[PDB]
Amino acid sequence: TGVSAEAGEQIFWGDGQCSTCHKIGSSGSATRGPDQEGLAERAEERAKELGLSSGLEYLVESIIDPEKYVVEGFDKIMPRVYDPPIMLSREKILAVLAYLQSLGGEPDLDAIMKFKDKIPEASKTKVKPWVPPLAVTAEEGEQVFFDESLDVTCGKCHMVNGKGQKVGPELTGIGAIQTPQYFVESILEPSAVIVKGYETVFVITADGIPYNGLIKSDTEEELTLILEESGSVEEVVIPKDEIEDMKKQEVSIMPGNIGELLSVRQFYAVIEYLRSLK
Ligand code: HEC
Ligand code: HEC
Ligand SMILES: [Ca+2]
Ligand SMILES: [Ca+2]
Ligand SMILES: [Ca+2]
Ligand SMILES: [Ca+2]
Ligand SMILES: [Ca+2]
């Protein structure tokens, strides 16, 4: 579809998967990444701060090297879309760049095209295929995921296609977005990345009772937290009137000992399951 901003808009809201994480003002509802309304103008500001040549160069860097600069308030969750699974072609990334420049600015197609030699070609990805050291299947991993008899049951906290229970984020479709490496890190190092909105907060009530957990809901009169302990979850409803302090923290309520609770086989099975959630 070429390299125009109109083509980039279809890709951003389509095969580029950008809108599964990024909203744009009132269009879309995703929150894993920042709202991209006015991105073009704050790209100029980032480029100034980071000593880059132009806002566009910052936009390029944000795609080709998402880890190189991490927007305040977010963790290293953005994938390299020219790598699997997304495997976004080079012409499509050039189009997306044109769309990003349109978010509060004007696309500059000549200037975008000079960056073509910096955009990796998806077909030429260097990522090695994922081959687990054991034969496992996604179906086997689905069984593990929802197995209430185990010492950890992903389904107690995650929903997939209407099955499971909501504590952490819904995992439907994450296999089309994320890498096996991200699944490994998510399972064995759960606080390395905290999905936006699923932070733990420390609450102290006026009476001096502590509650530490994630926010399920937040009304004018009630704060409902989900607490975790030894793989179990429980809700507490805290009157807003009685809250003395509330501080966000960097621990995830996802258990930190899953490497002790899953076998090697179960672990690689679950990963095959996540990869399959397209
Ligand atoms: C969820 C897994 C995401 C995907 C899919 C996309 N993005 Fe993303 N992006 C995400 C986060 C959490 C952040 C902030 C952390 C960081 O890496 O800086 C970003 C950031 C950007 C930016 C910079 C925004 C800024 O305010 O400076 C850009 C320009 C950007 N992302 C572009 C972008 C594109 C074009 C995507 C589809 C090809 C895309 N992102 C997907 C999370 C996620
Ligand atoms: C409740 C006590 C949980 C259990 C049991 C499991 N997970 Fe979890 N997970 C939970 C939360 C609150 C979050 C968000 C905060 C964070 O740690 O990032 C997550 C996150 C994930 C992710 C990242 C999702 C994303 O959108 O990027 C993954 C891939 C994930 N969790 C996988 C996973 C697996 C495979 C589990 C069973 C072995 C599992 N989780 C259990 C809370 C809880
Ligand atoms: Ca970045
Ligand atoms: Ca995590
Ligand atoms: Ca009140
Ligand atoms: Ca706890
Ligand atoms: Ca209790």
- For the chain, the structural domain boundaries read 5-124, 138-193+255-275, 200-248
Backbone angles phi, psi at 77, to 5 degrees: -115, -20
| Dist CA 215 CA 200 (whole Å) | 7
Distances (CA, A) of 255 to 68, 190, 238, 266: 28, 7, 23, 16
| Dist CA 101 CA 4 (whole Å) | 11
How many CA within 13 A on the CB side of residue 132?
21
**Centroid of chain to Cα 62:** 15
Provide the token pair at 34.
């920042």
| Dist CA 141 CA 4 (whole Å) | 41
CATH level 3 topology of 200-248: SH3 type barrels. (2.30.30)
Q: Which of ligand 1's atoms lies nearest the C-alpha of 81? A: 38
| 277 touches 176 (CB < 8 A) | yes
**Centroid of chain to Cα 24:** 16
Burial class (CB in 10 A: 0-12, 13-18, 19+), 5: buried
Q: Which of ligand 2's atoms lies nearest the C-alpha of 267? A: 38
| 253 touches 226 (CB < 8 A) | yes
Ligand 1: residues with CB < 6 A are: 16-18, 20-22, 32-34, 39, 42, 46, 59, 62-63, 66, 69-71, 74, 77-79, 81, 88, 96, 100, 177
| 183 touches 275 (CB < 8 A) | yes
The ligand minimizing its distance to the Cα of 21 is 1
| Residue-level length of the chain | 278
Architecture label for domain 5-124: Orthogonal Bundle (1.10)
Q: Quick check: do 5-124 and 138-193+255-275 share a fold?
A: yes
Q: Torsion-angle region of residue 240: left (phi > 0), alpha (psi -120 to 50) or beta? A: alpha
CATH level 3 topology of 138-193+255-275: Cytochrome Bc1 Complex; Chain D, domain 2 (1.10.760)
Question: Which of 133, 58, 127, 134 has the alpha carbon at shortest distance from 97?
Answer: 58
Place of tokens 């950890």: 152
| Dist CA 41 CA 101 (whole Å) | 9
Experimental method: X-ray
Contacts of 151 (CB under 8 A, 6+ apart): 231, 261
| Dist CA 16 CA 267 (whole Å) | 29
